[PDB]
């Protein structure tokens, strides 16, 4: 796609991000029951890719967290910022703590503070440095709000392994 088209679409994503309420009510995607909100970012139905070389993961990102999406890649939590970076953005990307055939976020618990993951979209590849690692009740995801003046992406999965009673949140902060 041509540069001028990419920039218009990114401008749309930014406008969307700057419209978001800073205080979503995020419901646990794993225990809950077709999305157009991220159409500007979509190429063949994917909005991006998330790579965590620290653990050998590189998987596609799709809009929403339907079970169809989570079977095949990472799902973007609607109500959070779209993964294009910027101040006052906080995107949440979700994936299973492993599937039969796919590692997905199986080893997210092995990511450490200071390590760097990458989110690639139609425009560029963004780098995020891990700054926090937390475990919370599934019924507590709303806290994962957009923080004024910060550019964050949280990677979200279930824990402990093979139990999945709780949720692991690994938050990275934009490296400018
Ligand atoms: Ca929609």
Residue numbers in the entry: 57 to 89, 94 to 236
Task: Show me the paper's own sentences about this structure.
The pilin subunits of GBS are assembled into high molecular weight polymers via a transpeptidation reaction catalyzed by specific pilin-associated class C sortases, through a common mechanism involving specific motifs present in the pilin proteins. The pilin-related sortases, which are integral membrane cysteine transpeptidases, cleave the LPXTG-like motif of the pilin proteins and, via the Thr residue, covalently join the C-terminus of one pilin subunit to a Lys side chain (ε amino group) on the next subunit. In this work, we present the high-resolution crystal structures of SrtC2 and SrtC1 from GBS PI-1.
